[PDB]
């Protein structure tokens, strides 16, 4: 009856870049999910194959918590069947996803005067990512002549997070909960 | 943003509604469907994604609606299963872009009206209504909607009140008022003209004191 | 579900005005609220997305405000083409719930129904039916009550009412009430009264015939 | 001749109101005065004859009053089709004086012109002429001033429209070797001269 | 009963013109026929009065040298002829219906437009600018009236302001359409001059 | 001075069938006093301007709705059978409401008008025939009295109230 460590996932001081999105495995814990969807602090809360008010009366084996940062105009891409730089090259959800996508504006934490450049995203790739795949390649992108490690671009690009940005360019924190032997997480 | 024309169907029937989005790339926009009931309420039918897209319904409708798309024809369909009780309403196809966005362009094209179980096409029974005097024309017991009601072939248009029909005992009732001066009538003829396309009926009733 | 309660249900506003419609969600939605408008006889149109952002091809008169669970749509120096219905939609979580709806109407002065008597027709009787019509034309506002009286006795049954939808050019409302009965009972009474109660008259002068 | 001085020249009234137009003759005319109505763009209509008597149609809203040399046409619970022009004619003596004329308008709460500037077209120049258009749409009321400024110097044909019955407001439009540019406008709404 | 009147004429100064007004719907025999002039300057002037039973005239001393008000009971018509017809007295003319003393003029005719000022095809030019952009169509240098201006096939009707017209006429029309309708979709100003038919698609200056 | 007081301010007026005529001669007149009296409802002059005119005076009583008939070229019972004006008339027609003088409760019947006649009157003719109209009558009431009396009551509508008429011929 040890509670689930949702504080260490949602209230982490620092979040990862979307190209290197974090995964925390949640097991052997009792969860009270109300506290999340009734906290009113969230801008997006999309669930698939499960209801937010009807997910507390069910048990799962394990819960995977993938977390990252994107820009406002990219929050739309964190959904099954979406395309774009984030969905094609950074973080791709499968079509049969049965989890939830929670997002909230983080201008007060991840932007600063002079720009926060710690958050990166992948701009180019040779092919679309597979579902839940992580790409940490640092190879020069080949747009005919080989690049020899030096039409040859850095694969990752840093976000220009300034507090004065418009809402579509403001930072948004994203948590993707995936639900999946005896069942160890329950409500 | 075109949609199928309104249909009048009888209970026990399946009907399918089409919505062809034009002016943009239909392939990468969520398509929502919405029902408007006459209780000043707009319920959410659901949402479908074209180009490899799962569908997510409202639980009130997860058993009543089926959503499909066709990228090639660039259209989206929604099929209503069974007869939707006496609950006939208007249906819309919306255009969602994704989270932190809204439904931008809308189609009103399709209206859904479900006929009564025991139905017979019936021509109107029209009666004049005699007492700036107000005159009337009562159009009772017709099916189905609608029934055009004009005065003197569209001559009299000011001061005319053609009231909406009402469904009573599976038939429709309408009434019209015309305010014509006490010197014009009975001096000049007043003829309420009623047209019923369903029975191909055209009738003209003169009001006499 | 999330519950959207937008207020007021309706309000009567003059031209050139500035109005604000409120919208209240059951929980904070962090500005993920959209605004919709429906004109009479014409389709819907998205005006505001993500709380405060305005869409392409939408006039500068419109604006959005609010946060948490309280939000507001605002119009300034109102023009003719804004008299329509307005709704607030939420996209924070499934299912997308819609608000109740606020309607706008032209602020007019009061008025007096032209309530008429209209005894039943002859052809209606030859067919067999009997229906007494009571037209109430060109009045304002919506709030009006109508009762029928058979020689003083209130008869709730047998009444069929029809309303009109728009002020339109006349800027006014209208109503029709039909006490439709059967012949066997219509041929037993003398007085036939249409008592209409409106804000204008403390006592409701009636229309009757013998 | 007899002199009819009817007042006012024009007035802006709201719907559902009760209005009275006065008419005053230079001498007593013993109630031989008629009242006439003209709708916008359409013909005239006789409403009142011999002071207080009504014409064919002529709803109960209209009435007449007065005596001697002072008379009054009255409307109560003004209806939509009453925003028009009205005249008091006299028939007591040759010639019929017919009076001056009163206009009716809908009272609105000000307005703001959507003034747009319009540089000359190419074909206009190929023909040889050069004309710059300045549209001022959807404002209220009729009184408004417009000036042109060619490189700062104040220097044209103006045309007005009547009340667009939908929005109840007015609009106006103001229009090579010389051509080879500013529309200064002044309105009651803005203390400062909005310009394009 | 609502009468009828002669059609508008286009006349040059110094010319005599005849105007008709035919009485139907009532007893033409027992009604005086009045004539009235309405102009932008000194509006609603009284031309005069005639009795059709005899044809005697009681025209007012004003002008009285430019008008003759003969009638014909048989065709059930009343005529008014204008003789002087100077440039400045262009107006609309009305025939009224007087019943007699202690009465007024009740029924009137639709009215005739007379222009005494001294054929030109229209010069049509698009008007492009330098959320709701306003476009224009300028019709310069045509004679005589009228011209019909539409947008598309009559589709665009809301938000349109067509304003009224050197012996030539100037006209302009403004249409205010959202920044998404234009320049994304074509707007074509259609001008008809009864034997000219011109179509100008609106193109931005750039 | 011209004796206009005795014509306009006469206590009693004549019936229209027997209209009175007073000849005015050898006198200086100030016609201003007439058009500035403001007491008159109709004042139509023919072939002469009253503002510049600066004589036979025919007077009688009719009802309001018959005042329109007192003009050249008119028809109806008054113009056809009682008082007929020529086409070339060059005089003035003056009328004013006299309800306060010629009506009374129960009706003032001293004023008569001719109802039937075999043919139209000539201009300025007077007919005081009282022979029974053949619609033979042998002098006894299809046999009608030619004249009918006006029922002038103060409560009458304006179209049935008495109006005094003075016709000036030059």
Structure-determination technique:
X-ray
| Residue among B42, B56, B125 minimizing CB distance to C127 | B125
Element (H, E) at A66: strand A63-71
B43 and B18 share one domain: yes
For residue A167, which residues of chain C lie inside 8 Å, CB to CB? 31, 50, 52-53
Strands A100-105 and A44-47: antiparallel
> What b/e string do you get for C175-192 counting C-beta neighbours within 10 Å, with b at 16 or more?
bbbbbbbeeeebeeeeeb
State in Å, rounded, how far the first CA of chain E is from the last one. 58
Q: Is the peptide bond before C186 cis (omega within 30 degrees of 0)?
A: no
Chain F, 47 to 76: residues with Cβ < 8 Å from chain D are: 50-51
Q: Find out whether C47 and C37 touch, Cβ atoms under 8 Å.
A: yes
Structure tokens at E194: 């009864």
Q: Which domain holds residue F4?
A: 1-106+154-170
| Residue among C15, C17, C170 minimizing CB distance to D168 | C15
List of E strands, A118-184: 120-122, 141-142, 152-153, 156-158, 171-179
Burial of C157 (0-12, 13-18, 19+ CB in 10 A): exposed
- Evaluated on CA atoms F7, F9, F10, F16, the torsion sign reads positive
Q: Do A73 and B100 touch (CB under 8 A)?
A: yes
CA separation for the pair A13, A16 (Å, rounded) = 10
CA separation for the pair E36, E93 (Å, rounded) = 6
Element (H, E) at C34: strand C33-38
CA separation for the pair C162, B162 (Å, rounded) = 10
Question: Any idea what DSSP says for residue C126?
Answer: H
D67 in reach of chain F (CB within 8 A): no
How many C-beta atoms lie closer than 10 Å to residue C166's C-beta? Answer: 13
| Residue among F64, F75, F87 minimizing CB distance to E56 | F87
Cα atoms in the Cβ-side hemisphere of radius 13 Å centred on E206 = 1
A84 and A170 share one domain: yes
CA separation (Å) from E186 to D119, D133, E29, F82?
20, 21, 60, 78
B51 and B84 share one domain: yes
F127 and F65 share one domain: no
Chain E, 38 to 67: residues with Cβ < 8 Å from chain D are: 43-46, 48-49, 58, 60-62
Angle at A138 between CA A137 and CA A139, to 5 degrees: 95
Listed in sequence order, the DSSP H helices in D36-135 are 122-127
CA separation for the pair C70, F162 (Å, rounded) = 78
- Evaluated on CA atoms F58, F59, F60, F63, the torsion sign reads positive
- Evaluated on CA atoms A142, A145, A151, A152, the torsion sign reads positive
Structure tokens at D112: 């703001």
CATH number at residue E197: 2.60.40.10
CA separation for the pair F151, F107 (Å, rounded) = 5
3-state secondary structure of D121: coil
- Chain C: nearest CA to A46, how far in angstroms? 5
E144 and E96 share one domain: no
CA separation for the pair E81, E66 (Å, rounded) = 8
Resolution of the model in angstroms = 3.5
For residue E30, which residues of chain F lie inside 8 Å, CB to CB? 75
- The CATH superfamily holding the domain D116-187 is Immunoglobulins (2.60.40.10)
3-state secondary structure of E123: strand
Give the CA-trace dihedral at A70, A75, A80, A85, to 10 degrees: -50
Angle at D60 between CA D55 and CA D61, to 5 degrees: 110
Domain boundary at B79, B114, B149, which? B114
CA separation for the pair D100, D87 (Å, rounded) = 7
Burial of F133 (0-12, 13-18, 19+ CB in 10 A): middle
In 3D, which of A33, A23, A28 has the Cα closest to residue A2? A28
Parse chain C into domains and list their residue ranges.
4-106, 122-209
Q: Which domain holds residue E92?
A: 4-115
Number of domains in chain A: 2
Q: Residues 6 or more apart from F114 whose CB is under 8 A from it? A: F16, F17, F77, F81, F82, F127, F146, F147, F148
Angle at A124 between CA A118 and CA A126, to 5 degrees: 140
Q: Find out whether D137 and D113 touch, Cβ atoms under 8 Å.
A: yes
B102 and B148 share one domain: no
A39 and A102 share one domain: yes
Element (H, E) at E115: strand E112-115
In 3D, which of B92, B85, B141 has the Cα closest to residue B116? B85
Q: Is the peptide bond before B146 cis (omega within 30 degrees of 0)?
A: yes
CA separation (Å) from A31 to A3, A48, A66, A129?
6, 19, 17, 32
Give the CA-trace dihedral at B10, B16, B17, B22, to 10 degrees: -160
In 3D, which of B160, B120, B111, B161 has the Cα closest to residue B142? B120
Q: Find out whether B163 and B174 touch, Cβ atoms under 8 Å.
A: yes
CA separation (Å) from E47 to D86, D88, E56, F28, F33?
19, 16, 15, 35, 28
φ, ψ of residue F5 to 5 degrees: the values are: -60, -45
| Residue among C27, C32, C53 minimizing CB distance to A44 | C32
How many C-beta atoms lie closer than 10 Å to residue B67's C-beta? Answer: 22
Task: Evaluate whether residue B105 is within a structural domain.
Answer: yes
Element (H, E) at A107: helix A107-110
Q: What is the architecture, at CATH level 2, of domain D4-106?
A: Sandwich (2.60)
A72 and A149 share one domain: no
- Evaluated on CA atoms E74, E75, E80, E83, the torsion sign reads negative
> What b/e string do you get for A82-95 counting C-beta neighbours within 10 Å, with b at 16 or more?
beebbbbbbbbbee
Structure tokens at E23: 């009485």
φ, ψ of residue D183 to 5 degrees: the values are: -120, 85
- How far out from the chain centre does Cα D41 lie? 12
Q: Do E100 and F68 touch (CB under 8 A)?
A: yes
Q: What share of chain C is helix, strand, coil (3-state, %, to 5)?
A: 5, 45, 45
B100 and B185 share one domain: no
Query: D111: which strand partners?
Result: none
List of E strands, chain D: 4-7, 10-13, 19-25, 33-38, 44-49, 53-54, 62-67, 70-75, 85-90, 102-106, 116-118, 133-139, 144-150, 153-154, 158-160, 170-174, 182-187
Number of domains in chain E: 2
Question: Any idea what DSSP says for residue B144?
Answer: S
3-state secondary structure of A73: helix
Domain boundary at B114, B144, B166, which? B114
Question: Any idea what DSSP says for residue C146?
Answer: E
Strands B7-9 and B112-114: parallel
B102 and B19 share one domain: yes
User: Which residues does a chain break follow in chain D (C to N more than 2.5 Å)?
Assistant: 155, 175, 180
Q: Residues 6 or more apart from D156 whose CB is under 8 A from it? A: D148, D174, D175
Q: Do A79 and B98 touch (CB under 8 A)?
A: yes
- Looking at chain D, which subunits does it touch, using at least 3 CB pairs closer than 8 Å as the criterion? B, C, E, F
List of E strands, D4-90: 4-7, 10-13, 19-25, 33-38, 44-49, 53-54, 62-67, 70-75, 85-90
Q: Find out whether D118 and E125 touch, Cβ atoms under 8 Å.
A: no
F84 and F164 share one domain: yes
CA separation for the pair B209, B160 (Å, rounded) = 20
F85 and F43 share one domain: yes
For residue E133, which residues of chain C lie inside 8 Å, CB to CB? none
B35 and B88 share one domain: yes
Q: Do C58 and E178 touch (CB under 8 A)?
A: yes
F13 and F73 share one domain: yes
- Evaluated on CA atoms D137, D142, D148, D149, the torsion sign reads negative
In 3D, which of E156, E184, A78, C54 has the Cα closest to residue B24? E184
For residue E103, which residues of chain F lie inside 8 Å, CB to CB? 68
Structure tokens at E179: 């920044």
Give the CA-trace dihedral at E147, E151, E155, E158, to 10 degrees: -90
F101 and F112 share one domain: no
F128 and F46 share one domain: no
A153 and A168 share one domain: no
A104 and A158 share one domain: no
Burial of F120 (0-12, 13-18, 19+ CB in 10 A): exposed
CA separation (Å) from C155 to A21, C146, C202, F157?
73, 11, 22, 45
* Radius of gyration of chain B, Cα coordinates, nearest whole angstrom: 22
Strands D70-75 and B148-151: unpaired
Q: Find out whether C6 and C102 touch, Cβ atoms under 8 Å.
A: yes
Q: Residues 6 or more apart from D159 whose CB is under 8 A from it? A: D172, D173, E163, E164, E165, E170, E172
DSSP string, C36-104: EEE-TTS-EEEEEETTTEE-TT--TTEEEEEETTEEEEEE-S--GGG-SEEEEEE-SBSS--B---EEE
Structure tokens at C200: 């204008």
In 3D, which of D106, D97, D139 has the Cα closest to residue D11? D106
CA separation for the pair B142, B124 (Å, rounded) = 4
State in Å, rounded, how far the first CA of chain A is from the last one. 11
Cα atoms in the Cβ-side hemisphere of radius 13 Å centred on E106 = 19
Chain B, 102 to 161: residues with Cβ < 8 Å from chain D are: 132, 158
CA separation for the pair C208, D21 (Å, rounded) = 37
A61 and A95 share one domain: yes
F42 in reach of chain D (CB within 8 A): yes
E100 and E156 share one domain: no
Domain boundary at B95, B114, B133, which? B114
CA separation for the pair B206, B126 (Å, rounded) = 11
CA separation for the pair B141, B167 (Å, rounded) = 9
Residue with tokens 């924190």: A173
Q: Find out whether B6 and B113 touch, Cβ atoms under 8 Å.
A: yes
Query: C21: which strand partners?
Result: C73
Q: Residues 6 or more apart from D72 whose CB is under 8 A from it? A: D20, D21, D22, D23, D64, D65, D66
Structure tokens at B86: 């006496």
Region label for E85, one of left (φ > 0), alpha (ψ between -120 and 50) or beta (otherwise): left
Chain D, 64 to 83: residues with Cβ < 8 Å from chain C are: 77, 79-80
CATH fold for domain C122-209: Immunoglobulin-like (2.60.40)
CA separation for the pair F86, F73 (Å, rounded) = 7
Burial of C95 (0-12, 13-18, 19+ CB in 10 A): buried
φ, ψ of residue A131 to 5 degrees: the values are: -55, 125
In 3D, which of C120, C124, C146 has the Cα closest to residue C133? C120
Largest Cα span, chain A: 60
Residue with tokens 């946060």: C67
3-state secondary structure of C169: coil
CA separation for the pair E75, E77 (Å, rounded) = 5
CA separation for the pair E58, E108 (Å, rounded) = 19
Angle at D69 between CA D63 and CA D75, to 5 degrees: 20
- For chain D, how many residues are written? 196
Q: Find out whether D83 and D106 touch, Cβ atoms under 8 Å.
A: yes
């Amino acid at each position: 009856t040890n509670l689930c460590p949702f504080g260490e996932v949602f209230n982490a001081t620092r979040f990862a870049s979307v190209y290197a999105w974090n995964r925390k495995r949640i097991s052997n814990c009792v969860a009270d999910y109300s506290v999340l969807y009734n906290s009113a602090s969230f801008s997006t809360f999309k669930c698939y194959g499960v209801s937010p008010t009807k997910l507390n009366d069910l048990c799962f084996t394990n819960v995977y918590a993938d977390s990252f940062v994107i820009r406002g105009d990219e929050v739309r891409q964190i959904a099954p069947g979406q395309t774009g730089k984030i969905a094609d090259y950074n973080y791709k959800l499968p079509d049969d996803f049965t989890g939830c996508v929670i997002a909230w504006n983080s201008n007060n934490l991840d932007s600063k005067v002079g720009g926060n450049y710690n958050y990166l995203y992948r701009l180019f790739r040779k092919s679309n990512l597979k579902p839940f795949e992580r790409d940490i390649s640092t190879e020069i992108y080949q747009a005919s002549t080989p690049c020899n490690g030096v039409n040859c671009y850095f694969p990752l690009q840093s976000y220009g997070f300034q507090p004065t940005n418009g809402v579509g360019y403001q930072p948004y924190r994203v948590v993707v909960l995936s639900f999946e032997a005896p069942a160890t997480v329950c409500g | 943003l075109q949609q199928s024309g309104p249909e009048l169907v009888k209970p026990g029937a399946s009907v399918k509604i089409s919505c062809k989005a034009s002016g943009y790339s239909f392939t990468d926009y969520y398509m929502n469907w919405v029902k408007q009931s006459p209780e000043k309420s707009l319920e959410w039918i659901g949402e479908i994604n074209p180009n490899t897209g799962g569908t997510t319904y409202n639980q009130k409708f997860k058993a009543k609606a089926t959503l499909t798309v066709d990228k090639s024809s660039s259209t989206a369909y929604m099929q209503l299963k069974s007869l939707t009780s006496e609950d006939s309403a208007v249906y819309y196809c919306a255009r969602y872009y994704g989270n932190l966005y809204a439904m931008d362009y809308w189609g009103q094209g399709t209206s859904v009206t479900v006929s009564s179980g025991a139905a017979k096409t019936t021509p109107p029974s029209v009666y004049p209504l005699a007492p700036m005097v107000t005159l009337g024309c009562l159009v009772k017991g017709y099916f189905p909607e609608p029934v055009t009601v004009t005065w003197n072939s569209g001559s009299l248009s000011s001061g005319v009140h053609t009231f909406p029909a009402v469904l009573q005992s599976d038939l429709y009732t309408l009434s019209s008022s015309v305010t014509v001066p006490s010197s014009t009538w009975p001096s000049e003829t007043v003829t309420c003209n009623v047209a019923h396309p369903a029975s191909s009926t055209k009738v003209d009733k003169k009001i006499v004191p | 579900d999330i519950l959207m309660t937008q207020s007021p249900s309706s309000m009567s506003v003059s031209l050139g005005d500035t109005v604000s419609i409120t919208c209240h969600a059951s929980q904070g939605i962090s500005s993920n609220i959209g605004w919709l408008q429906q004109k009479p006889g014409k389709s819907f149109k998205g005006l505001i997305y993500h709380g405060t952002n305005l869409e392409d091809g939408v006039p500068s008169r419109f604006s959005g405000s609010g946060s948490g669970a309280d939000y507001s749509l605002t119009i300034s120096s109102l023009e003719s083409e804004d008299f329509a219905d307005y709704y607030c939609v939420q996209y924070v979580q499934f299912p997308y719930t819609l608000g109740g709806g606020t309607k706008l109407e032209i602020k007019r002065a009061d008025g007096a129904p032209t309530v008429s008597i209209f005894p039943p027709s002859s052809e209606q009787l030859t067919s067999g039916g009997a229906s007494v019509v009571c037209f109430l034309n060109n009045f304002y506002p919506k709030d009006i009550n109508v009762k029928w009286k058979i020689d003083g006795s209130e008869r709730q049954n047998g009444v069929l009412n029809s309303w009109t939808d728009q002020d339109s050019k006349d800027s006014t409302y209208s109503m029709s009430s039909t006490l439709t009965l059967t012949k066997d009972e219509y041929e037993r009474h003398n007085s036939y009264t249409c008592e209409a109660t409106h804000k204008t008259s403390t006592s409701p002068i009636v229309k009757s015939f013998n």
